[PDB]
Ligand binder design. Structure first.
Ligand SMILES: [Zn+2]
Ligand SMILES: [Zn+2]
Ligand SMILES: [Zn+2]
Lengths: 263, 245, 48, 43
């Protein structure tokens, strides 16, 4: 309301974002966001994050390759000039470099079974699953994303001078400012939160092994001599929990030395 | 052993290191290292805890500091006994190493206004009254090495610096045959990595365990034992009578 | 609402309790202790 | 309501009308009228 209406309408004629985004970001009442949306003539599954779906479509006489994340709905679309397995391999290695994907869902197209695709998936260690996907929910998400991207591309084609620019603007508005129907958050935020909350077991196990690799020298309350190389479990501000021949001991920080004997 | 005897002799005539030092550095058996040492006519808690003291040697006052946990040594001869130079040495050693607590006596120089101001500015806790056996053993060892290298000493400051250098680097210590520098490096690195990993957890792992009382937080489960912390108290219980949620 | 007998018996019971407390006091005779104030590095004393 | 907030502000800076009056004469929702009244240092 502190001149937020003008900036909101500017970013809506430039972006055409959802009204929840206008309400949350610019701190304006929902009525203003709804009327801004109305004023625009162009507007009216929890699983493993390693699952992605890749598809190709023919729009405006050009071939578009779209990769979608199953767990969050994040999308990445590119315009491929000449349909060749080399460009499909390029897109696959790009998405592998930018994301730790582990499983890709594709149909039985000629370019999907190319030798370059097989080499890339074998080198990157990515599981390949051809054929119809087993989850109708993923297909429904694919259809919804396809229709939404078609609509936004039709809306934004007037601003851009090339199809690639329009596709990139569409993916930018979808990923960052657009808010999904569940929770009302951006797709990029959802996918980044899922990735952040996904890498927990590997780091937990590696930290456990590393903390067990440590060596501790401790003394008792009335014992002036130091003990042997007790394995380390947990370190605290003033107490340390260690193992010494299948015995759990809590030692004050004053009488404990922590070392990694390199030799 | 590959021409290592000649370099061992050329370094023993230089620093007169301990037998284990050149035994481990140049990869020689301990017997030949002991023989080289004998052949010389001149030879036969917490990371933040540091102890500082004053000594007198031939009309010269020397302020000497020592890390209690690793045995590292520093020293500086103060020309005129005053608290301002003690504060200067304290701030220099703070700038060169992280110190959280210093153990000194009730001396005027240690409690001087400049020293107190510097230690309060640096946020270093003060403890008066003092462990001492190790400090005295290090003091007499450094006196021995000072006497060893005094034959080539042009001035007192250079002799003290060379004695510190040979003590901290040119001599292997106790457990593991590691010098004071190696020990302090190891303890600092272990502290850093342990605190980093400790800050890594409690951001991902957050479980509530009920035993016998209250909603204690899980600390370590395994080997048929559950160690937990609650109300700033650590308790260890068997796997039975403990439910993890 | 209690007569003289209750008053005197309560007074004697209180006297017995205070005698027990004074015996607890006399359990400690010299027991020299040193103390500090506000976590100051200086140790202060002597104290009784 | 279409840019009527500015008109309400420029009328309130002179007459300092009530929220009901500024809502009725310019077709403003009651919440906007109330916050405009609140934002005035005199009302
Ligand atoms: Zn719009
Ligand atoms: Zn020698
Ligand atoms: Zn007013």
């Amino acid at each position: 309301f502190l001149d937020g209406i003008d900036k909101a309408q500017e970013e809506h004629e430039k972006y055409h974002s959802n009204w929840r985004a206008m309400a949350s970001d610019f701190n304006l009442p929902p009525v203003v966001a709804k009327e801004i949306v109305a004023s625009c003539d162009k507007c009216q599954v929890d699983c493993s994050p390693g699952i992605w779906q890749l598809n190709c479509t023919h729009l405006e006489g050009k071939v578009i390759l779209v990769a979608v994340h199953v767990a969050s709905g994040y999308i990445e679309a590119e315009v491929i000039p000449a349909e060749t397995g080399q460009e499909t391999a390029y897109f696959l290695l790009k998405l592998a470099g930018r994301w730790p994907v582990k499983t890709v869902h594709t149909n039985n197209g000629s370019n999907f079974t190319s030798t370059t695709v097989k080499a890339a998936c074998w080198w990157a260690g990515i599981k390949q699953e051809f054929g119809i996907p087993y989850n109708p929910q993923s297909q429904g998400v694919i259809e919804s994303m396809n229709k939404e991207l078609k609509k936004i591309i039709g809306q934004v084609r007037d601003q851009a001078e090339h199809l690639k620019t329009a596709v990139q603007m569409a993916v930018f508005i979808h990923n960052f400012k657009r808010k999904g129907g569940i929770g009302g958050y951006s797709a990029g935020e959802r996918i980044v939160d899922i990735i952040a909350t996904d890498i927990q077991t590997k780091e937990l196990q590696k930290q456990i092994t590393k903390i067990q690799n440590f060596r501790v020298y401790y003394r008792d309350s009335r014992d002036p001599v130091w003990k042997g190389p007790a394995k380390l479990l947990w370190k605290g501000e003033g107490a340390v929990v260690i193992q010494d021949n299948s015995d759990i001991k809590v030692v004050p920080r004053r009488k404990a030395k922590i070392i990694r004997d390199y030799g």
